[PDB]
Design a protein around this ligand. Structure first.
Ligand code: Y01
Ligand code: Y01
Lengths: 393, 393
C-alpha cells in the first residue's frame, strides 16, 4: 500500500532543507571560520550525531531493499504486522534530526546573539534528541520508540533475559557504532573538568599540564568504553550457549569477541609502556601485530562463511557463492566481498588508534576520516546477514 | 488518479530549497547589502519575474479547487480529457523558477566570480525562462508549453481569430499582469539607452539629475504598453459583438474596457505636463480622479452582478447569493466580496501617501507593495468565475 503524499512531501522537504544547510555550512566553514582557533572538539562532539543520522538513512535503505527483495523480515524480527515502518518514515526521521543537527552546528559557528558564547548548543541538541527518544506522550511514532526502548532495556541487561534475533542484531549494530559512545565519554569529561564553565569566550588554546585529560587513559576511563559492546555480545553468546547447550557456534563466538578484548587491553598496555618508556616496549609492539592478525583473520572467516553463508560446497554455477540467492546480480556479492576485507582492517585500525592514544597529531584525523566507513560496512553486512537468516528458516 | 510519489518528492524538495533560499536571501539583504547605490532599478529588473512565479503557484491552488469543488473545468477549457496537468506539476514548475530567481538574485547580491561582474545574471535568468518556454525538444511538458505558446499567439492576434473560453480567460489574466510588461520595457530601456556597459558592477549613485530617462513617460512609451492588454480585450469584445449580433452583454464590456484608455491617457498627460508648468494641471487631475471612480465602479458592478452572478433579485434562503452553490462556506463568499471591494478601490489608499508625504521615492514603494495584490484578486476571482461558468454551461 503506497504511503500518503504528505509523507513523501515531508521527506522531500527535509531532504532539500538538509542539502541547502549542508552547502551553506560548508561555505561558512571555508570562508567565515578562522584556522587559528582549534576546532577539533567541535568535530569530536558532532561526529556521534552525524553517525546517527547516517545510520538512520542507511537503515531506511536496508528496509527498502528487504521489502523489494522479497525477504519476510517482519516475521524474522517478530514485529507486529499491523504497525510497521517503511523506508519513508525512517527517511523523514533522519532528515528532521539532520536538520536539527545542521541548525545546531550553524548556530555554534556563527553564534548570532547570546550572553553564553557557544557551549549550550551541543547540549541543547543532544537533550532534544534524548527527549524525543523518551517522550512520555503518545505521538511521533510512540509504538516504535516504546519498542526500541524495551529492546535497549533487554540488551543492556543481557545476561539475564533470553536472547532473541533483535537483541543480537542491535548488539552488533551498537558494536559498529561505538564511536558515539566514545564521543559521549569525551564530551562528559571535557564538560566536567576541562572547560571553564564559570568564564566567557569558551574554547582557548591549552598550555597547562592538566590539559587533555580525556586524551589520556587515566586508569580505565578509556578502554572499557571501547570494549563495552564486545562485553555485551560476549555475555549474550555465553547466555545463549547456556540456554541451548550447543558447543560449536557459541564457543567459537566467545573467542571471536574476546579477540578484540585482548587487542584492546594489549593496546592499553602498549600505551602505558610508552608512558613508562620500557626497553621491551618495542617487543610489546610485535605481539600487538600478532593479535591484530588473529583479530581480523578471525572475523573475516566469520563474515563470509557463517554470517553471510558463502563458500558453500554446493555452489555449482554460482562461483564462490551459495546455491540459492534472491538478489538479481552477483556483482553486488563480489563487490561486497572485495570491500569487506578492505574495510575490516581500517575498522580495527581505527578502534586501536582511538583508545591507544597513538598518533598524537594524525590519530584524530585518521579516526575522523575512517569513522563513516564502518557504518557503511555494517550497512553492507545487513543485507546478506538477513538474506542468509531468511533462507535458513 | 493519484500522482506518482516521485512528483510529490520533487515538489517537496523544491519547496524546501525555495524556503531556505528565501530566508538566506532576506538575511543577506538585511546584512550583506550596502546602501550607497540606488537599488531601485534592481527591483524593476526582478519584481516582474517574481510576480510570474507567484502567479504560477496561485494557479496551482486554483485547479485543486476545481478538482474538489466539482467544478468541471477540463470540459469547458477544451482540454484533453485523458491528459491533464495536476497542481503538483504547477507547484514544482513554480518552485524550479523560484529557485532560479533566488540563485540569480543571490549571485547579483554577492558577485562571487570577478569576471562577469553584474549584468549577465538577469539576462541569463530571463533567457533561461525564454528557452524553457520555446524549447523545441519533446521534454519537460511538451504538450503544456506547446498549448501555451499556441494560445499566446492566438491571444496576441485578437482581432482576427475566433473567440473562445481559454482565449478571453488568458486575456483577463494578462489584464492583471501588465506590471511584467512595464518592468520588461524598463529593463530594455535601461540596458539600451543609459547603462554604461564598459563598467564593472557600476557602483555609481544615481542621485545625479541626469538620471530618470526611462523612469518618466516622456515621449509616451509606457502608456501604450500599459494599455496593450486593455486594447486586446477591447478588440476581442468588439469581435464578440460583431459575431453575436447582440449588444446586451458586449458593448457595455467594451465601454468598461475603454474607460481605462481615458484613465491612462489622462494620467500620462498629467505626468508629462507636471514639469512643463501647465498651471491648469488640477483640471486634468480632477478628470483623472473622476474617471478613476467611474472605472473602479464599472468594474465593481461588472464583477459582482454579472461576472459572478451575485446579488440576484430572487435569492431565497441564501441572502445576497445565488441559488445553487458548490463551495460550503458562505463566509468565503462574503470575504471575497469584501476583499474585492477593498482591492478594486485600493488605488485611493496609495494616492493618499502620494498626496500627503514628502518622502523621496514614494510612488515606487507603494507600487511594488501593491503589485502582488492584483494577482491575488484575480486568483480569488477565478474560483467564482469558473463556478458560474460551470453552472451556466
Ligand atoms: C567500495 C566499493 C569497492 C564497493 C561498494 C559496494 C556497494 C556500493 C554495493 C555492495 C552491496 C550493494 C547492495 C547489494 C544489494 C542491494 C539490494 C537491491 O535491491 C533490489 O532492488 C533488488 C530486488 C529487485 O529489484 O528484484 C538494491 C541495491 C543494493 C542495496 C546494493 C547497493 C550497492 C551495494 C551497497
Ligand atoms: C486576506 C483577506 C483580505 C481575506 C481574503 C479571502 C481569502 C482568504 C479567501 C476568499 C475565497 C477563499 C477560497 C474560496 C473557496 C475555497 C475552496 C475550498 O475547497 C476545498 O479544497 C475544501 C472543500 C472540502 O474539502 O469540503 C478550499 C478553500 C478555498 C480555496 C478558499 C480559500 C480562502 C479564500 C481564498
Amino acid at each position: 500500500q503506497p504511503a500518503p503524499a504528505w509523507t513523501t512531501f515531508r521527506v522531500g522537504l527535509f531532504c532539500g532543507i538538509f542539502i541547502v544547510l549542508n552547502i551553506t555550512l560548508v561555505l561558512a566553514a571555508v570562508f567565515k571560520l578562522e584556522t587559528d582557533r582549534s576546532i577539533w572538539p567541535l568535530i569530536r562532539i558532532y561526529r556521534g550525531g552525524f553517525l546517527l543520522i547516517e545510520f538512520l538513512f542507511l537503515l531506511g535503505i536496508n528496509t527498502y531493499g528487504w521489502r523489494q527483495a522479497g525477504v519476510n523480515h517482519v516475521l524474522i524480527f517478530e514485529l507486529n504486522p499491523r504497525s510497521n515502518l517503511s523506508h519513508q518514515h525512517l527517511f523523514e526521521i533522519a532528515g528532521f534530526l539532520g536538520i536539527l543537527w545542521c541548525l545546531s552546528l550553524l548556530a555554534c559557528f556563527f553564534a548570532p546573539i547570546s550572553v553564553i558564547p557557544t557551549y549550550v548548543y551541543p547540549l541543547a541538541l543532544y537533550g532534544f534528541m534524548v527527549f524525543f527518544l523518551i517522550n512520555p506522550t503518545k505521538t511521533f511514532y510512540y509504538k516504535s520508540r516504546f519498542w526500541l526502548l524495551k529492546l535497549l532495556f533487554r540488551v543492556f541487561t543481557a545476561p539475564f533475559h533470553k536472547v532473541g534475533f533483535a537483541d543480537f542484531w542491535l548488539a552488533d549494530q551498537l558494536n559498529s557504532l561505538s564511536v558515539i559512545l566514545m564521543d559521549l565519554e569525551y564530551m562528559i569529561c571535557f564538560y566536567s573538568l576541562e572547560l571553564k564553565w564559570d568564564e566567557s569566550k569558551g574554547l582557548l588554546p591549552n598550555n597547562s599540564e592538566e590539559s587533555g585529560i580525556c586524551h589520556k587513559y587515566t586508569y580505565g576511563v578509556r578502554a572499557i568504553v571501547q570494549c563495552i559492546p564486545a562485553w555485551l555480545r560476549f555475555i549474550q553468546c555465553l547466555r545463549r550457549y547456556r540456554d541451548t547447550k550447543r558447543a560449536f557456534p557459541h564457543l567459537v563466538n566467545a573467542g571471536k569477541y574476546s579477540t578484540t578484548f585482548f587487542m584492546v587491553t594489549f593496546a592499553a598496555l602498549y600505551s602505558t609502556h610508552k608512558e613508562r618508556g620500557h626497553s621491551d616496549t618495542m617487543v610489546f609492539f610485535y605481539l600487538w601485530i600478532v593479535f591484530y592478525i588473529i583479530s581480523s583473520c578471525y572475523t573475516l572467516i566469520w563474515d563470509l562463511k557463517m554470517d553471510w553463508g558463502l563458500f558453500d560446497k554446493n555452489a555449482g554455477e554460482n562461483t564462490f557463492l551459495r546455491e540459492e540467492i534472491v538478489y538479481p546480480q552477483k556483482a553486488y556479492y563480489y563487490c561486497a566481498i572485495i570491500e569487506d576485507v578492505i574495510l575490516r582492517f581500517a575498522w580495527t585500525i581505527q578502534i586501536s588508534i582511538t583508545s591507544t592514544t597513538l598518533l598524537p597529531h594524525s590519530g584524530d584525523i585518521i579516526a575522523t576520516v575512517f569513522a563513516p566507513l564502518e557504518v557503511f560496512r555494517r550497512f553492507v553486512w545487513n543485507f546478506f546477514r538477513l538474506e542468509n537468516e531468511h533462507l535458513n528458516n
